[PDB]
Amino acid sequence: MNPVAFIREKREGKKHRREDLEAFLLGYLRDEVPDYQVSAWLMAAFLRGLDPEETLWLTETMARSGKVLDLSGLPHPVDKHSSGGVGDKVSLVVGPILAASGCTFAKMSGRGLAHTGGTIDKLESVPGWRGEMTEAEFLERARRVGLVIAAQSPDLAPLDGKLYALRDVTATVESVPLIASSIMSKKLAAGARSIVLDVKVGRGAFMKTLEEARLLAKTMVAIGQGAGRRVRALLTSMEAPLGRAVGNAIEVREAIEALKGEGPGDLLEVALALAEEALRLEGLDPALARKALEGGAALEKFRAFLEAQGGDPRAVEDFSLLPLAEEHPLRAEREGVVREVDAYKVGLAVLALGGGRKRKGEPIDHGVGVYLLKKPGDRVERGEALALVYHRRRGLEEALGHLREAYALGEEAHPAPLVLEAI
Amino acid sequence: MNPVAFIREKREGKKHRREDLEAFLLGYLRDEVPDYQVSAWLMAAFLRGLDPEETLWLTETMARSGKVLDLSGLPHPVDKHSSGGVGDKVSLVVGPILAASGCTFAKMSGRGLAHTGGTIDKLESVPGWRGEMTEAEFLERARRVGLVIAAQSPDLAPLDGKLYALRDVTATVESVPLIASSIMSKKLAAGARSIVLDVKVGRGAFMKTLEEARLLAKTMVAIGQGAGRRVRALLTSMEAPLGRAVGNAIEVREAIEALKGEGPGDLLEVALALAEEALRLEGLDPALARKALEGGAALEKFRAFLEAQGGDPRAVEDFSLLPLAEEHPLRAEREGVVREVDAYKVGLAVLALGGGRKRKGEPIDHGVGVYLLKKPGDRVERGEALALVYHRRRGLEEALGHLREAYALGEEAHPAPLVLEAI
Ligand SMILES: [Cl-]
Ligand SMILES: [Cl-]
From chain A, the residues in CB contact with B35 under 8 A are 34-36
Question: If we measure between CA atoms, which residue out of A141, A204, A218, A157 comes closest to residue A340?
Answer: A204
- Closest ligand to C-alpha of residue B46 is 2
Contacts B8 to A, Cβ<8 Å: 171
CA of A8 to the centre of ligand 2 (A): 7
In this complex, the residue of B5, B43, B48 whose CB is nearest that of residue A11 is B43
Subunit contact B170:A38, Cβ cutoff 8 A: no
Known catalytic membership, residue A115: no
DSSP state of A271: H
List phi, psi (to 5°) of B77. Answer: -75, 125
Q: Can you tell me the distance from the alpha carbon of A110 to that of A153, in angstroms, rounded to the nearest whole number?
A: 6
Q: Which CATH architecture has domain A1-67?
A: Up-down Bundle (1.20)
Q: Reply yes or no on whether B167 is catalytic.
A: yes
Give the list of residues 6+ apart from residue B64 with CB closer than 8 angstroms, or none: B188, B189
- Catalytic residue from among A80, A122, A162, A167: A167
CA proximity to B177, closest of B16, B360, B4? B16
Torsion of CA B10, B14, B15, B18, to 10 degrees: -60
Cβ-defined contact of A39 to B44 (cutoff 8 Å): no
Give CATH superfamily name and number for B324-415. Pyrimidine nucleoside phosphorylase-like, C-terminal domain (3.90.1170.30)
Question: How far is B7 from B5, CA to CA, in rounded Å?
Answer: 5
For B282-302, give the DSSP string. TT--THHHHHHHHHTHHHHHH
The set of residues, in sequence order, having a beta carbon less than 8 Å from that of B361 and lying 6+ positions away, is: none
Q: How many Å apart are CA B179 and CA B223, to the nearest integer?
A: 12
Ligand nearest to the CA of A42: 1
Of B4, B43, B166, the CB nearest to A43: B43
Nearest to A171 among B40, B171, B172 (CB): B40
Ligand 1 centroid–CA A204 distance in Å is 13
Residue of A nearest to B10 (CA): A171
* Ramachandran region, residue B408 (left: φ > 0; alpha: ψ -120 to 50; beta: rest): beta
Question: What gap in Å lies between CA B79 and CA B360, rounded to an integer?
Answer: 25
Q: List the single best residue of A7, A16, A162, A170 to mutate versus B (max B Cβ within 10 A).
A: A170
For B40, nearest residue in chain A (alpha carbons): A40
- The domain segmentation of chain A, as residue ranges, is 1-67, 68-323+416-423, 324-415
> Phi-psi region for residue A202, left (φ > 0), alpha (ψ -120 to 50) or beta?
left
Question: Three-class SS string for A147-179?
Answer: EEEECCHHHECHHHHHHHHHHHCCCCCCCHHHH
Question: What is d(CA B325, CA B327) in angstroms, rounded to the nearest whole number?
Answer: 6
Measure the CA–CA gap between A356 and A337, rounded to whole angstroms. Answer: 29
Measured CA distances, B385 to A57, B329, B339, B374, B381 (Å): 58, 6, 16, 8, 9
- Best of B39, B163, B178 to substitute, by most chain A Cβ atoms within 10 angstroms, is B39
Inter-chain touch A37–B166, beta carbons under 8 Å: no
Strand partners, A77: A104
Q: Are the Cβ atoms of B171 and A11 closer than 8 angstroms?
A: yes
Residues 149-188 of A with CB under 8 A from B: 166, 169-172
Cβ contact A248:A369 at 8 Å? yes
Burial state string for B150-173 with b = 16 or more CB within 10 A and e = fewer than 16 = bbbeeebbbbbbbbbebbebbbbb
Question: Is B194 an annotated catalytic residue?
Answer: no
Minimal C-alpha gap between A47 and chain B (Å): 8
Distance from CA of residue B409 to its chain's centroid? 28
E strand or H helix at A411: none
The reply to whether residue B47 touches residue A42, judged by beta carbons under 8 angstroms, is no
Residue A74: beta bridge partners?
Answer: none
CB-based contact (8 Å) between A138 and chain B?
A: no
Query: Do A11 and B36 make contact, defined as CB atoms within 8 angstroms?
Result: no
Can you tell me the distance from the alpha carbon of B327 to that of A373, in angstroms, rounded to the nearest whole number?
97
- Name the residue among A52, A349, A337, A277 with its Cα closest to residue A181: A52
Distance CA A192, CA B45 (A): 41
Q: Cα–Cα distances in Å, from B200 out to A5, A85, B419? A: 25, 55, 10
Asked about A186 being catalytic, the answer comes back as yes
Report which residue type is found at A10.
K
A8 contacts B46? CB cut-off 8 A: no
Side chain identity at residue B20, one-letter code: D
Which residues are B79's β-sheet partners?
Answer: B195
Nearest Cα of chain A lies from the Cα of B41 at a distance, in angstroms, of 8
Q: Which residue of A has its CA nearest to B35?
A: A36
Distance from CA of A290 to the nearest CA of B (A): 45
Q: How far is B38 from chain A (nearest CA, A)?
A: 8
Cβ-based contacts of A24 with chain B (< 8 Å): none
Sequential DSSP letters for B323-364: ---EEEEEE-SS-EEEEEE-HHHHHHHHHHHTSS-SSTT---
| DSSP for residue A366 | T
> Do the beta carbons of residue A167 and residue A125 sit within 8 Å?
no
Best A28, A43, A164, A169 member to test B by mutation, with max B CBs in 10 Å, is: A43
- What's the CA angle centered on A317, arms A315 and A318, to 5 degrees? 60
Distance (Å) from CA A170 to ligand 1 centroid: 7
Selection from B419, B347, B418, B336 nearest residue B377 by Cα? B336
Nearest 10 degrees: CA dihedral of B317, B320, B326, B327?
Answer: 20
Measured on CA atoms in the order A205, A206, A210, A212, is the torsion positive or negative?
positive
Are A68-323+416-423 and A324-415 equal in CATH topology? no
What values do phi and psi take at A360, rounded to 5?
-55, 140
What Å resolution does this PDB entry report? Answer: 1.8
Q: Searching chain A, which residue's CA lies closest to the CA of residue B44?
A: A43
Residues of B in contact with A37 (CB under 8 A): 39, 169-170
Whether the CB of A44 is below 8 Å from some CB of chain B: the reply is yes
Q: Using DSSP, state whether B395 is helix, strand or coil.
A: coil
Name the residue among A381, A275, A367 with its Cα closest to residue A321.
A367
CA–CA min distance A39, chain B (Å): 5
Distance from CA of A26 to the nearest CA of B (A): 18
Contact B304/B145 with Cβ under 8 angstroms?
A: yes
Nearest by CB to B47, which of A11, A42, A166? Answer: A11
Identity at B226, one-letter amino acid code: G
- What residues of B are in contact with residue A48 (Cβ under 8 Å)? 47
Cα gap B59→B49, rounded to integer Å? 15
Q: Which of B205, B181, B217 is nearest to B421 (CA)?
A: B217
Nearest to B169 among A11, A37, A172 (CB): A37
CA A117 to chain centre: 9
Angstrom distance (rounded) from CA A224 to CA B255? 69
Q: Any residues with CB less than 8 A from the CB of B77 and at least 6 apart, and which?
A: B71, B103, B104, B106, B142, B191, B192, B193, B194
Nearest to B184 by CA among B159, B220, B149: B220
Q: Are A127 and A160 in contact (CB under 8 A)?
A: no
Distance CA B371, CA A4 (A): 37
Determine the 3-state secondary structure of B250 from DSSP: helix
Angstrom distance (rounded) from CA A206 to CA A201: 9
Could you tell me the distance, in angstroms and rounded to a whole number, from the CA of residue B174 to the centre of ligand 2?
Answer: 4
| CA dist., res. B225 & res. A339, Å (int) | 56
Q: Which of A121, A160, A365, A378 is catalytic?
A: A160
In chain A, the residue whose alpha carbon lies closest to the alpha carbon of B36 is: A36
Element housing B40 (H / E): helix B35-48
Residues in contact with B208: Cβ distance below 8 Å, sequence separation at least 6, in sequence order? none
Question: Sign (positive/negative) of CA torsion B208, B210, B216, B219?
Answer: negative
Cβ–Cβ below 8 Å for B4 and A37: no
The catalytic position among B79, B88, B121, B160 is B160
Taking a contact as any Cβ pair under 8 Å apart, which residues of chain B between 227 and 266 contact chain A? none
In the annotation, is B160 catalytic?
Answer: yes
Answer whether CATH 3.40.190.80 is correct for domain A68-323+416-423. no
> A391 phi and psi, to 5 degrees?
-125, 165
Tell me the pairing of strands B194-200 and B230-236: parallel
* DSSP result, B155-219: TBSHHHHHHHHHHTTTT----HHHHHHHHHHHHHHHT-SEEEEEEE--SS-HHHHHHHHHHHHHH
- The answer to whether B7 faces chain A, any CB pair under 8 Å, is yes
CA distances from A419 to A213, A266, A272, A346 (A): 13, 10, 11, 21
Nearest to A350 by CA among A123, A91, A114, A82: A114
